[PDB]
Design a binder for these strands. Structure first.
Ligand SMILES: [Mg+2]
Ligand SMILES: [Mg+2]
Ligand SMILES: [Mg+2]
Ligand SMILES: [Mg+2]
Ligand SMILES: [Mg+2]
Ligand SMILES: [Mg+2]
Ligand SMILES: [Mg+2]
Ligand SMILES: [Mg+2]
Ligand SMILES: [Mg+2]
Ligand SMILES: [Mg+2]
Ligand SMILES: [Mg+2]
Ligand SMILES: [Mg+2]
Lengths: 159, 170, 293, 61, 213
RNA sequence: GUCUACGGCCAUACCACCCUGAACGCGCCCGAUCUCGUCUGAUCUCGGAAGCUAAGCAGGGUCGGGCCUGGUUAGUACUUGGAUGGGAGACCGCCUGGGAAUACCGGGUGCUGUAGGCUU
RNA sequence: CCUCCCGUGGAGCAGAAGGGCAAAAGCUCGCUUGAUCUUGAUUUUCAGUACGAAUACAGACCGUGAAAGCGGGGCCUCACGA
RNA sequence: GUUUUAUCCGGUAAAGCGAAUGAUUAGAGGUCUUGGGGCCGAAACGAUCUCAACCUAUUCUCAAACUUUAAAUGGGUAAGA
RNA sequence: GUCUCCGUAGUGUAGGGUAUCACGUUCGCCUAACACGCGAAAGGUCCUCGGUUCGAAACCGGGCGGAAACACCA
């Protein structure tokens, strides 16, 4: 009984944030997108051309094609019990770079720097990041102060 | 003591004749305004259609023309001569500009013509200071500021010192 | 007050300000988006625009390309540096706009090292001219005009600056419809009255026209023209040798000034302690005034 | 007469019985959907890669 | 012709206000929410007693009207007509519907049963939560037992369980009775009508110097 | 220490009123022969340089409104998972993790890129 | 009818509603026919079939503007047929 | 059919209405009007008493087709030859 | 209950750009008088509300009523 409209249910999804209507800031147009880099699809509603479908809002894909105003993105979409890599053309207003990829490339560069430096200076260093370890043993000083005694408060109806 | 850039002056005078209907009467009123000002006026259409006044939407109802400068000063002088240099206290708006009405256009300079009616008209002079054009300019427009504005008291004072007139308390 | 206060608390709570330069009335962002944004398949290729801004006493010509952190200006020319050579009075007119556009073009070409090639149209005439890139040589510099909020009717000084630049050798796409020689009736470009405007002959005609009717009006209008004796007969030769000087030396040298004491001409922002003390003093004084009664 | 209209009950279990496999990420994606102007220039570059082979091997050596 | 309140006791549906979608709603049974000397100043009636629901349920507008009438009659009888002020703190904003069936010996007469069963607006009820105040009575400090008895009598007009609580606030204000006097003394509070205006120590000093003057 | 041109983020930048502004500048300002537009040289376009910082503009101020950021609200509301927990129910308590928002009370009131000036 | 001031849009954008929009996408003018000729790719429903609708390109021929550009119908979500 | 570490996405629960849009209770303070009027005001309501409307600051109660703010659970991507 | 239609001077009725006809009512004639007849006039939020429209009695929705037709097989 649901309609199959392209923008059904996008009332808040494609709406602008509070007090952020009007002219689109130009740094979004000034961003550079190469083939192979990772972008997040958002889909602002001020620009009605090149809009992604509502199923790609919030998804992340890889750029494979660059045109004058849009990019081609390979983004995974789950349909029933299969995931297929859809290719969508999205204008650059509706995308932004992925800071997850940015941080990963930064970490790779920093790890390569550490490898070179540590091979230069001999001593082995850890590069694989570990999960949070159990807390080590330590001493807690009282500083000559008795810890405060806490008791539950009596009940009373307030309002 | 007083900065010369604060001196009041007439910006525009804005003559208006609101003939009820269109046609020959409106054309004659336009001729009246053109002869009075040495300057072509423009026609104003009705915004809405009302049956009480018998006018239709987009029908040319009135005629008007804005006059600036020395010509505005002379025309205001003639109008105040007809008014005998007296104005009511309520003739001045709170934004610092005022106006009045003349019942017959032939008592100020213009002589009667048989092909010309007995049209009355509205004078509405707008006062200003040097620098009010920043609200109207295209690039880097802005407001004039509180001290640079003109009050009703300032307009009445300017009328009294320039046109040595009488402000009736009515 | 019997009308609802429109600018109440909720009005300011929901008010969304425009961009700072839009509020200042300096930038048309609708035109800027179309003017500075490069195609995405051109990547980091710069898009150059020639900004022309005619001021009450100056003309500013700049060449800039947009970046995320702000516009990057590669070359700037001003009408106030014209008195360095040739013309010194009667700036901010069409002839000075041509001169400063030509100076910008020559200076940019000299910085990029393209002077022997792309000499431009040295012999000035009002006719249309478009530089063509020479094969086996670096391509002609291509930029687009940025007129800002100026009304682009026929005879605008921004188009005077554009004509100066394209005669200097910059490849700016344009048409002659906005040059002063264009006749809006016959849709034909004269290209001679345009050269008269470039050489400032309209101003010379105004000078000699005022001389023969009202000498004191001529003095009042061209008061600073009288100083150093700039005359209508020599105006055209002055502009020609100004163009020649521009072509001969377009390089800008900066003026040094460092022996300046650090003096502050603005009141600093008051501190929280000072504001609190001021409030306390005002309260104490008011209570004192009451107890005096 | 009447009957059930729609459900997704048991559908997730059916989906996960053989696993919900992601698309096989494999090197050298196809050039389908790429800008034709860019593709034809890419083809020209690939075609003319042959020349400059002597310079390339001289640099390598 | 009204159904028993047990058919609409519980908050089973989403809130269904009278709006541009729900049209044709009959007017609620309760139209007056404030009774007694409503114009009494703040210091006149220092004692406040609330009646607080212990159940998440729906109270009908007729039930609110009946409880208000009962409490008003007892308060007028005991404390006099000008010795109290009552405020009902529940408004019947939730429309309850009815799927009307024909009460005749026939199902062939286009009864349709459960087909198209969405109902017509029957009435309005107020949704109350645990800990929410239903009625409030402010009066003199010596009428505490009369307030408790009036609220106890009003409890019998409602389905669920209710508690009677003598609040620590001064009257109908939100400020504690012990701090109220010295707050008014130091002019943190300014009386007006039945309420007090809180005057914070920020804003223009003109508002500060119109006070202390 | 500031300004101008072009900006990026787009109120810590806005709004109201008041005070101050050296030098450049930006302006207000003067005029309509030419270019160009008007009912009107008011706007736009053009040619200027007598006067003025009155206004715009810049800086500062306001127990200012707003905005931004904190505290409180509050481990409250709500919530993942659990029980052969309680209760006639309505609902509620506990275990296991997560965890808000008003009112109220503080602090702050643009940062900065490119190019070019002024400031002994 | 004429004038000034305030006015974050509380108007308008053909229609239902929702989103979007202020030197806009609204209003008024000027010039026009990109509502044209073509091949593929893609999104939406989806079985990843079709129709319909839509997005990004590419090749012509044009319109407009000083130009950057924008335009292959209607600001977007419907208005249709082996 | 999992967690962790980064990084986006969202508008439900809650909350809010002295914040927009709708709904809504009661007082308080002001001063214009085709509010009623008002007792002795026609005489310039010589007067100013009340009730309206209006405005201002507050106040009670709400929203599936309201919202500034905004969870838990959740969805995408990345964690290299 | 479902579906359809109607609402206009006092009465019965016609009919997107200042509401018709007939009877009724008022006034003056004719007659000794009434009636008939003759000459004039007045009389209607077009049921209520909202919307489209420059403009609504009309066009479109909601409500007040009124009027028909269905309301079967067990
Ligand atoms: Mg433009
Ligand atoms: Mg069954
Ligand atoms: Mg089935
Ligand atoms: Mg029974
Ligand atoms: Mg239900
Ligand atoms: Mg503040
Ligand atoms: Mg818990
Ligand atoms: Mg094409
Ligand atoms: Mg479109
Ligand atoms: Mg939703
Ligand atoms: Mg809720
Ligand atoms: Mg509200």
């Amino acid at each position: 009984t649901n309609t199959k409209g392209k923008r059904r249910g996008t009332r808040y999804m494609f709406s602008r944030p509070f007090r952020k209507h009007g002219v689109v800031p130009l740094a979004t147009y000034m961003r550079i997108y190469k083939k192979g880099d990772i972008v997040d699809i958002k889909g602002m509603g001020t620009v009605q051309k090149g809009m992604p479908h509502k199923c790609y809002h919030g998804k992340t894909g890889r750029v494979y094609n660059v045109t004058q105003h849009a990019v081609g993105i390979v983004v995974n979409k789950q349909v029933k019990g299969k995931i297929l890599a859809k290719r969508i053309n999205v204008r650059i207003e509706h995308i932004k770079h992925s800071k997850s990829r940015d941080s990963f490339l930064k970490r790779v560069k920093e790890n390569d720097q550490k490898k070179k430096e540590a091979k230069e200076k001999g001593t082995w260093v850890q590069l694989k990041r570990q999960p949070a370890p159990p807390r080590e043993a330590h001493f807690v000083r009282t500083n000559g102060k008795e810890p405060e005694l806490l008791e539950p408060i009596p009940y009373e109806f307030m309002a | 003591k007083e900065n010369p850039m604060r001196e009041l002056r007439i910006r525009k005078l804005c003559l208006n004749i609101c003939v009820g209907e269109s046609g020959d009467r409106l054309t004659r009123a336009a001729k009246v305004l053109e002869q009075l000002t040495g300057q072509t006026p423009v026609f104003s259409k009705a915004r809405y259609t009302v049956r009480s006044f018998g006018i239709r939407r987009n029908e040319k109802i009135a005629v008007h023309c804005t006059v600036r400068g020395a010509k505005a000063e002379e025309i205001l002088e003639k109008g105040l001569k007809v008014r005998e240099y007296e104005l009511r206290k309520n003739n001045f708006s709170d934004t610092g500009n005022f106006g009045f009405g003349i019942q017959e256009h032939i008592d100020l300079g213009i002589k009667y013509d048989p092909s010309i009616g007995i049209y009355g008209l509205d004078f509405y002079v707008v006062l200003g200071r040097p620098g009010f054009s920043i609200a109207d300019k295209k690039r880097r427009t802005g407001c004039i500021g509180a001290k640079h504005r003109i009050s009703k008291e300032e307009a009445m004072r300017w009328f009294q010192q320039k046109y040595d007139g009488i402000i009736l308390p009515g | 007050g019997f009308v609802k206060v429109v600018k109440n608390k909720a009005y300011f709570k929901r008010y969304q300000v425009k961009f700072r330069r839009r509020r200042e009335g300096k930038t048309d962002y609708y035109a800027r988006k179309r003017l500075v944004i490069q195609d995405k398949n051109k990547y980091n290729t710069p898009k150059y625009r020639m900004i022309v801004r005619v001021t009450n006493r100056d003309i500013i010509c700049q060449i800039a390309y947009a970046r995320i952190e702000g516009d990057m200006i590669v070359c700037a020319a001003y009408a106030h540096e014209l008195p360095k050579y040739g013309v010194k009075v009667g700036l901010t007119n069409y002839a000075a706009a041509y001169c400063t556009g030509l100076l910008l073009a020559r200076r940019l070409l000299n910085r990029f090292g393209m002077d022997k090639i792309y000499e431009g149209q040295v012999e000035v005439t009002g006719d249309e001219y478009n530089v063509e890139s020479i094969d086996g040589q670096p391509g002609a510099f291509t930029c687009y005009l940025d007129a800002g909020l100026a009304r682009t009717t026929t005879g605008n000084k921004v188009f005077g600056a554009l004509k100066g630049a394209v005669d200097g050798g910059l490849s700016i796409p344009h048409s002659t419809k906005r040059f002063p020689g264009y006749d809006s009736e016959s849709k034909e470009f004269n290209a001679e009255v345009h050269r008269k405007h470039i050489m400032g002959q309209n101003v010379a005609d105004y000078m000699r026209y005022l001389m023969e009717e009202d000498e004191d009006a001529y003095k009042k209008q061209f008061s600073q023209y009288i100083k150093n004796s700039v005359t209508p007969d020599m105006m055209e030769e002055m502009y020609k040798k100004a163009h020649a000087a521009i072509r001969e030396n377009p390089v800008y040298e900066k003026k040094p000034k460092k022996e300046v004491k650090k003096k502050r001409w603005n009141r600093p922002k008051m501190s929280l302690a000072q504001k609190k003390d001021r409030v306390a003093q005002k309260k104490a004084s008011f209570l004192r005034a009451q107890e005096r009664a | 007469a009447k009957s059930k209209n729609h459900t997704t009950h048991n559908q997730s279990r059916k989906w996960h019985r053989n696993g919900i496999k992601k698309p096989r990420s494999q090197r050298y994606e196809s050039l389908k959907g790429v800008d034709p102007k860019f593709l034809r220039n890419m083809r020209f570059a690939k075609k003319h890669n042959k020349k400059g082979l002597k310079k390339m091997q001289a640099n390598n050596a | 012709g009204r159904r028993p309140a047990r058919c609409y006791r519980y908050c089973k549906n989403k809130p269904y206000p009278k709006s541009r979608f729900c049209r044709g709603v009959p007017d609620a049974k309760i139209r007056i929410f404030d009774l007694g000397r409503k114009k009494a100043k703040v210091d006149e009636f220092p004692l406040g007693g609330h009646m607080v629901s212990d159940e998440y349920e729906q109270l009908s507008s007729e039930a609110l009207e009946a409880a208000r009438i009962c409490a008003n009659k007892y308060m007028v009888k005991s404390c006099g007509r000008d010795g109290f002020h009552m405020r009902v703190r529940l408004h019947p904003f939730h429309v309850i519907r009815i799927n009307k069936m024909l009460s005749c010996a026939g199902a062939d007469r286009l009864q349709t049963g459960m087909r198209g069963a969405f109902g017509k607006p029957q009435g309005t009820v107020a949704r109350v939560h645990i800990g929410q105040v239903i009625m409030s009575i402010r009066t003199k400090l010596q009428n505490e037992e009369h307030v408790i008895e009036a609220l106890r009598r009003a409890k019998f007009k409602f389905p669920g369980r209710q508690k009677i609580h003598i609040s620590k606030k001064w009257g109908f204000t939100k400020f504690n009775a012990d701090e109220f006097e010295d707050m008014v003394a130091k002019k943190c509070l300014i009386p007006d009508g039945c309420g007090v205006k809180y005057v914070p120590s920020h804003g223009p000093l003109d508002k500060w110097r119109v006070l202390h003057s």
